[PDB]
């Protein structure tokens, strides 16, 4: 029994129809579904072992699923792999191994106004001279969305800008630019167009779609989604290849709709030939495309069929000259760094060296939090969560799952930021990870030792540091003493063999028997286990 997931805005019951062609040769029927918000809830149900058999989604997300081993690696015959364009397999790889089947391909194209503009420029540089023309009778040359990088990245990446370097089958989180002479050359030309009036600088997505669909602008930059609302706009248009900057093709981000196979699925065996020899023919794709258009498709066979649409032939051409969008989670910092970096460069608020060098350092900063959290094993997380309790509500500490999430929660409450490492440095120092402090933060041990005597500099309250140092000198068996040497006392507790001594302190604060000035209970139970646990209390209680 095959079960397919796919979004509602797709041709899902055209997919349900190749699935009924399939069952009359098989008996095994498939039931396509469009669960609401399926991208978010597939990780949740697959770790239970219940996700559909096949999952249809954009490729960028499939990386996170594979990072958690939620998609098994497919095994297509190599003679099959040639049935599709070469680049579409670079989008379905993690650790170099193939993960999903490419289905469709999406990219931005140049969309012009044939009545207004009979011939499109081959070239970005032709446009200032051109906008000067149409300006002479109250119409702009180009108007497109400048509020997101996805629309401004093609010009920026043209001269050699890239997000992450894809080489020999996998990405390098270390190499990213964004701060190279290509990204600078493309952004300066963008910044100046605005500087010169050839583009108003608050042109959002809908302002541009207004100007174009009303014949106020010669051309725009958009994708196959905006085709519907300009077909009804009643303006004669065409879409072709984006102009060339510095003699080099504009590189838009390419999205690949892909079908992945669930790792915890009985039917991987049979899900393959459903995709290879029924869905991915001219027959299965024209079925889904006759429902709702797949845009341009990855299968070479049916693509040429669709290419006699001048529009599908163009979104395909830009896709080839384009940049396959990386499917790794470090890309969430890319959109922030670059969106804020074009918004400040184009407004005049920053230099393009200033803006882009700032974008670079934000990526180095977000990558460093990754590299740090990857060295923090699960016990260090329990320690870091207890030390962070003063400032992060443990309410929202149900969703906290790994060290990186703790770091992101701190960015939220603006105690960890690009310019303020002081709390993170103190956290690692408290939990005695001096190897990470030198390696990723350039901080000697004496320097932290000597940062925290300076008054009002240490943030973690000594009451927190006192309790953590006590949980450090208490073993599993020394804790079985604490557990039953406070049941001797009043409860004031549901305890159990699942709670470490730190979970006992939180649960004593929670009963208000252990506080910044409530230590009688604590001072007794420690004197019965290890006496020198008592001395830690007295030294803290010497400082007030």
Describe this structure in words.
It comes from Homo sapiens. This is Caspase-8. It is found in: Cytoplasm; Nucleus; Cell projection, Lamellipodium. Belongs to the peptidase C14A family. It is classed as hydrolase. By secondary structure, this protein is of the alpha/beta class. The protein folds into 4 domains: about 1-105 and about 255-325, D-Maltodextrin-Binding Protein, domain 2, CATH 3.40.190; about 110-250 and about 330-365, Periplasmic binding protein-like II (D-Maltodextrin-Binding Protein, domain 2, 3-Layer(aba) Sandwich); about 375-460, Death Domain, Fas (Orthogonal Bundle), CATH 1.10.533; about 460-544, Orthogonal Bundle (Death Domain, Fas), CATH 1.10.533. The protein is built from 25 helices and 17 strands. The longest helix is centred in the middle third of the chain and has 22 residues, at about 350-375. The protein is globular, with a radius of gyration of 29 Å. The relative contact order is 0.10.
Task: Describe the secondary-structure layout.
Layout (H helix, E strand, L loop, with lengths): L1 E4 L6 H12 L6 E4 L4 H9 L7 E5 H9 L10 H4 L11 E2 L2 E2 L1 E7 L2 E5 L12 H9 L5 E3 L6 H10 L6 E3 L2 E3 L8 H15 L9 H9 L3 E6 L4 H5 L5 E4 L3 E2 L2 E2 L3 E9 L6 H12 L2 H10 L4 E2 L2 H8 L4 H9 L2 E2 L7 H16 L4 H22 L4 H10 L15 H10 L9 H9 L3 H8 L3 H8 L9 H11 L3 H9 L16 H9 L10 H8 L4 H10 L3
Parallel strand pairs: 1-2, 1-3, 8-11, 15-17
Antiparallel strand pairs: 3-15, 4-5, 6-15, 6-16, 7-11, 7-12, 9-10, 13-14
The counted number of beta strands is 17
Integer-rounded radius of gyration: 29 Å
CATH architecture group name of the largest domain: 3-Layer(aba) Sandwich
Query: How much of the residues is beta strand, in percent?
Result: 5-15%
By CATH, the superfamily of the largest domain comes out as: Periplasmic binding protein-like II
Measure the end-to-end span. 69 Å
**Given the structure, what is the number of helices?**
25
CATH topology of the largest domain: D-Maltodextrin-Binding Protein, domain 2
Q: Biggest β-sheet, characterized?
A: 7 strands, mixed
Structural domain tally? 4
Name of the top-level CATH class of the largest domain: Alpha Beta
Shape type: globular
- Going by helix content, strand content and strand pairing, the class is alpha/beta
Which percent range fits the helix content? 40-55%
PDB class: hydrolase
Keywords: apoptosis, hydrolase
Assembly: monomeric
Entry title: Crystal structure of caspase8 tDED
């Amino acid at each position: 029994k095959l079960v397919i997931w796919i979004n509602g805005d797709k041709g899902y019951n055209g997919l349900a129809e190749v699935g009924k062609k399939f069952e009359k040769d098989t008996g095994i029927k498939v039931t396509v579904e469009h669960p609401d918000k399926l991208e978010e809830k597939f990780p949740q149900v697959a770790a239970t072992g219940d996700g559909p058999d096949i999952i249809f989604w954009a490729h960028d997300r499939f990386g996170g699923y594979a990072q958690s081993g939620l998609l098994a690696e497919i095994t297509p015959d190599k003679a099959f792999q040639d049935k599709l364009y070469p680049f579409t397999w670079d989008a379905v790889r993690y650790n170099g191994k193939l993960i999903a089947y490419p289905i469709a391909v999406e990219a931005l194209s140049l969309i012009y106004n044939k009545d207004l503009l009979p011939n499109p420029p081959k070239t970005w540089e032709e446009i200032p001279a051109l906008d000067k023309e149409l300006k002479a009778k109250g119409k702009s040359a180009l108007m497109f969305n400048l509020q997101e990088p996805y629309f401004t990245w093609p010009l920026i990446a043209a001269d050699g800008g890239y997000a992450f370097k894809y080489e020999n089958g996998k990405y390098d989180i270390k190499d990213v630019g964004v701060d190279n002479a290509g990204a600078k050359a493309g952004l300066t030309f963008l910044v100046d167009l605005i500087k010169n009036k050839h583009m108003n600088a608050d042109t959002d997505y809908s302002i541009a779609e207004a100007a174009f669909n009303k014949g106020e602008t010669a051309m725009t930059i958009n994708g196959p989604w905006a085709w519907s609302n300009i077909d009804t706009s009643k303006v004669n248009y065409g879409v072709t290849v984006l102009p060339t900057f510095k003699g080099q093709p504009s590189k838009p981000f390419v999205g690949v709709l892909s079908a992945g196979i669930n790792a915890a699925s009985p039917n991987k065996e049979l899900a393959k030939e459903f995709l290879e020899n029924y869905l991915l023919t001219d027959e299965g794709l024209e079925a889904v495309n006759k429902d709702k258009p797949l845009g341009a498709v990855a299968l070479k066979s049916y693509e040429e069929e669709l290419a006699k649409d001048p529009r599908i032939a163009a979104t395909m051409e830009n896709a080839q000259k384009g940049e396959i969008m990386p499917n790794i989670p470090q890309m969430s910092a890319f959109w922030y760094a670059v969106r804020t970096a074009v918004i400040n460069a184009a407004s005049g608020r920053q230099t393009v060296d200033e803006a882009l060098a700032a974008a670079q350092t934000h990526m180095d900063f977000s990558r460093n939090l990754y590299d740090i959290g990857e060295q923090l094993d699960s016990e260090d997380l329990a320690s870091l969560k207890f030390l962070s309790l003063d400032y992060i509500p443990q309410r929202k500490q149900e969703p906290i799952k790994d060290a990186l999430m703790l770091f992101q929660r701190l960015q939220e409450k603006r105690m960890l930021e690009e310019s303020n490492l002081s709390f993170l440095k103190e956290l690692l120092f408290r939990i005695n990870r001096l190897d990470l402090l030198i390696t990723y933060l350039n901080t000697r041990k004496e320097e932290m030792e000597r940062e925290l005597q300076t008054p009002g500099r240490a943030q973690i309250s000594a009451y927190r540091v006192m309790l953590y140092q006590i949980s450090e000198e208490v073993s599993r068996s020394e804790l079985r003493s604490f557990k039953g040497g406070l049941q001797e006392e009043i409860s004031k507790c549901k305890l159990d063999d699942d709670m470490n001594l730190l979970d006992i302190f939180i649960e004593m604060e929670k009963r208000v028997i252990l506080g910044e000035g409530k230590l009688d209970i604590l001072k007794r139970v420690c004197a019965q286990i290890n006496k020198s646990l008592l001395k830690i209390i007295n030294d803290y209680e010497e400082f007030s």
